[PDB]
Design a protein around this ligand. Sequence first.
Ligand SMILES: [Mg+2]
Lengths: 253, 114, 133, 209, 329, 106, 279
Amino acid sequence: VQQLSLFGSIGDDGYDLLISTLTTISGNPPLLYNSLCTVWKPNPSYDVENVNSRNQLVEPNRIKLSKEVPFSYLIDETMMDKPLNFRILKSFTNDKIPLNYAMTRNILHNESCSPWSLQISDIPAAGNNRSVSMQTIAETIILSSAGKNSSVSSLMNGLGYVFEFQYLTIGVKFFMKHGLILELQKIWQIEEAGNSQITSGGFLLKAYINVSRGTDIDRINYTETALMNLKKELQGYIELSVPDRQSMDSRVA
Amino acid sequence: MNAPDRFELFLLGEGESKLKIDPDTKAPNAVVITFEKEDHTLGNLIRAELLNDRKVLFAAYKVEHPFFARFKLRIQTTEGYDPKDALKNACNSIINKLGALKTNFETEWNLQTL
Amino acid sequence: SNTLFDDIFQVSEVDPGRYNKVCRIEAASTTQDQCKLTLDINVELFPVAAQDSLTVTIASSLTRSWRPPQAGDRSLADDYDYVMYGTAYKFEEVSKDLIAVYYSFGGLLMRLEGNYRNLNNLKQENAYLLIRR
Amino acid sequence: GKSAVIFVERATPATLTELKDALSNSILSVRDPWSIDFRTYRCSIKNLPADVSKLMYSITFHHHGRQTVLIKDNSAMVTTAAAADIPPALVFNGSSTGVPESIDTILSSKLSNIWMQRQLIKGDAGETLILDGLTVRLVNLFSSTGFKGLLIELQADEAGEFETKIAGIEGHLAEIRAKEYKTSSDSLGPDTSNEICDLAYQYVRALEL
Amino acid sequence: GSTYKHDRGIANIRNNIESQNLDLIPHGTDFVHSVKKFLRVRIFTKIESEDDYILSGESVMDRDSESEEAETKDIRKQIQLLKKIIFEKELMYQIKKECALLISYGVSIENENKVIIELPNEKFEIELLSLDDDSIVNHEQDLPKINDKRANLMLVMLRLLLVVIFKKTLRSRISSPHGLINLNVDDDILIIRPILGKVRFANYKLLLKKIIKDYVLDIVPGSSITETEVEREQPQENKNIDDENITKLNKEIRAFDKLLNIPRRELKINLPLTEHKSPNLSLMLESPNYCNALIHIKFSAGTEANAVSFDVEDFLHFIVAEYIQQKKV
Amino acid sequence: KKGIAKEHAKWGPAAAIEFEYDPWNKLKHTDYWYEQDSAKEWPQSKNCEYEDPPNEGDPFDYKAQADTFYMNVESVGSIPVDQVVVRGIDTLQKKVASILLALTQM
Amino acid sequence: RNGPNEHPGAKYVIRDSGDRIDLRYSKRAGDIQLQYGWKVERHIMDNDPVLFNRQPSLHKMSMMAHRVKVIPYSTFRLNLSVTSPYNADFDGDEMNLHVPQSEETRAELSQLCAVPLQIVSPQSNKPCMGIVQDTLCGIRKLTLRDTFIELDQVLNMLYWVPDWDGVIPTPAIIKPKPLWSGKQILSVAIPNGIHLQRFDEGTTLLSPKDNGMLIIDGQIIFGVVEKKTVGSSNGGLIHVVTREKGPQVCAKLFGNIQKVVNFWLLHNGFSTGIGDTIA
Ligand SMILES: [Mg+2]
């Protein structure tokens, strides 16, 4: 899959406004969502060349397991209660939900496992000046597991990977025109020695479109336009820009 | 150096069927079977047997170039008769003829004391 | 669809000048004095010696591709011993009411000299040559 | 749901039909064709000694969904390449792009450094024979090296006496002169919360020699 | 939210009389409208005790008043006019229901008018010409009638039923990428409006009545036999805690479900049984779009088991006759 | 390793294979090059004894076809002489079967 | 993706930026994503126009444009009838190949100096390529009155012609035994509309010695085909064909005449011995 995207940010200050605005531009409400991502690297004990049985220069990369956490495993207070995601995010700022996230990695709270989104991405498309961030993603869905060691952690080890780092993200997304999505988000590093919000101070803004093609230059070029239109329409309110490629490279590093 | 591997003569290529049956445009009820990793050994044998079939109107084979082990066989039959069936029968007749040939040689050999 | 010429000739000479399997035959009609014939024949297939009486027929039929057997059940338009198929290539006006027609049966040449068959012979690819006795 | 897999090692293209008819009486209906891709990944890891294992098997079924089971050292992982088969919630909150591909595609193209595809057996235009309390599938297995053998898949609703159903079919095999064949219902040990995975899995037992 | 498609909106400007004129970008301006068509309805029954084929109607009437206020200089009165505008947009929805008729064999005459009507007791229910719906000009007297009371129930249903459509449209939209645009493929989505109400009334009911006379063909044994929402209970549950993918999504799904009873309205089906070394049988009436299937079952439970199940009304009569023989008698 | 002569002539189990038919040129399959007499000039085959001489006072048999082949199969050692013939018959049979089977899969 | 080692592959990628990507070493030789306007320096492939030349080069015909045909083995293979213009033989001769780099340059080759265009030359206002050696030798042999072909071989000889109508010509002899003549089955290579007449010493309309030539509607009536007919002759079958049908049609005829003739002679055989010097 091809993910064309634009990024930016707002302090928690700007959120309230941005929201009211984004709802009008898109005509849909923001919808509350979250997801945990667990990153894995090749087992540093094993060691392998960078070539195939089909002499191909192939680089080691990280794997990313992603999925939803039902909010019941995430939220601090019922008193706050409510359905509203933005006023709720202030509640979440600076610091962690229950987490300790290890628990879920190996079941608990005699067990099989969930579905995951197993992904691996390449550095965004080399480009002298790109109007948009264009990134390739290889994905498969894991449906459930079976066998002796059926915990997701066992599975990853069986395949020769090792857990590297992880993070939770909670936000609202806007469903929009021609597959355009806008996520207003917050990210939290999850370690065993406690959790900290990566996005502390505000929200990561991501406007994107996943395209099935890649090899339909036309739909690719259409997609560029879509993103451009957005950045443009909001220009003078918020700049959507292309992130540094180097900063989106999940390789060995 | 520019020499192809010797097994290329008999060992089928990656995704390459023994037979490729294409229909002849220029003539009604006519077809063209391309035989990969095959030579005269089989071509001339089949062609000659199809000639024995009365319901077969046209039959010929050609090895378009010697660097490649493949041959095109063109079969034309009377209306109603299928050329694939014609080829099927000639193939069968050949086997049955060879079967008797073996049986007859075996019997005759066993009679010899040398 | 029908016959174009019929007569019985008598061979005067047979010639295989260097040719091992073919012969130029010289004949004249037993009926009409005006009528003569020159013809190349596959003598390895149907042998011919001089003074042989031979029925020589033309006919425009009995187009598209050629079929080999089934001729067992099919009507073999040959009540004759040797048959050829060729093309008419020249119409020589050899004086008076006299005409001469040239036929090539794939290289095997033929020259028929006479008069009457004005209302018969034509410049056609279609022309069979039938011979009996 | 119970299951068993039978592989006729010594066979030809025709062996299928022989058994097809030896059962021509014991039929109810015949449903639409099925398919199966069976891959062998040799691991690329030398750092791990001969003391622990290697090799992973990858079984793609065309059982309505483009689903693939991976098996290494008696542990089985279930994936899908079909966009429709994605858990809805994964798609909504952005975990999934909704663009899966085959786990094998990923293996051979992205992790090809760790895993090399050693063998690729396919079973095309399989036949689905339906009895009472026993669905029987049949297909001819082809490698990139020619015919490999004949394959029988036995799936049954009836947890009741599957033992007899298996024995009966092995009988029909003696009749058609089917000698030197290999059979598996697993080895008493694995546990099923999703039985299909295990059944699909056994294939490996039948195709390891 | 959700898409009729053609000519849908509103446009608004102020006159020198300090009143607001409501433009429509077509539906041509007339301060709080010019001429308005409400949707309207009307149900006829032709009985005569089966006498002279005399038909009368009765129509559930929606008239807030003919007198109009929407005062100049008052957008509050204009807010009321905006609500009127909403009703006018709603009638456009009944035009979609008109189209959704086109999929049925019950009245659409000349391509110039379509009349809603159904066979039994010959009756007719509601109307609005392929030209339009409810256009205002009549004398006003009050008398009611039994048909009239029922008819007001129709309108709200038919109206309601396409709020459903107006809703399951938005389900898909909110839920998945592409959007919903272009309306009712297979006239599966379309058909719901006015299609399933017609079906519902007519079919399951008349057929159930007819099945009951056939069950009077099994009226012979002392017997007993009972009907439930049991088929209805087994599928299509109402207002369930389960939800769907999401919290936001779950809510709307739930909203669909309870209203969904009405839209789903196939016949429930029924059964009958005996004890004393005990036998048992059972039948389900299925409407598939006003066409009626009756699929039955039957087991005679005893020391050694015997059973049969079968899934046309001619054969059903016959099956009942065969059942009398294999029953007690 | 197991192999065939197509890959390398080392896997050739047969030495020269002698092959002749029609020792009297009855079929007219060759036009004998000569100086005075083709009969005197060209040596008579061994197999002439196993066929009837044509007898000059007879017309050319065009209908005549080629059947009856005088052959000699020489083995190198790998396989016994008989099995060069048998396995040869069998290989060609298997080779034809593959075509029948190919059509079957198609 | 195929790369520098596989046969239909490529060596370099030239970006707009000007810098050359070496597919042999670039770490990005796999994940190389092309952009309109870039240049892919790809291998020479079947049907590319190329300049072929045999030195000295005292002729415009010593440098002609040919269609590529990638083949195995280390030699440049050429059609035998194109031997004469180059003045080549296969006693150890080497030849030069030049590859155009522009769409313009390619057009120049294909449109001005391609082999079929060069058939009739202005040097002597006649064909500079004709039928040679095996095909010339076999062509006489095939076209004698004596020469008759049985059905079996006729079918192979016919199928061998790549543009054959699918029409089995009526045998010159229909019973006893259907038989075709050389003249007949060679005429299948001769295209329709082709008219030729030649009288050699003693030619009559009855051509007793099978003298001269008579081809009517691209069908031989009489005479034996040889150097005067099918060679690089002024009155030639080739001269008429190029002029009447086109250079592309005539070029096809060369291949056709040879595919039939060579096939026939492969099965007829031809030798030469001391006995041939003996008187
Ligand atoms: Mg030289």
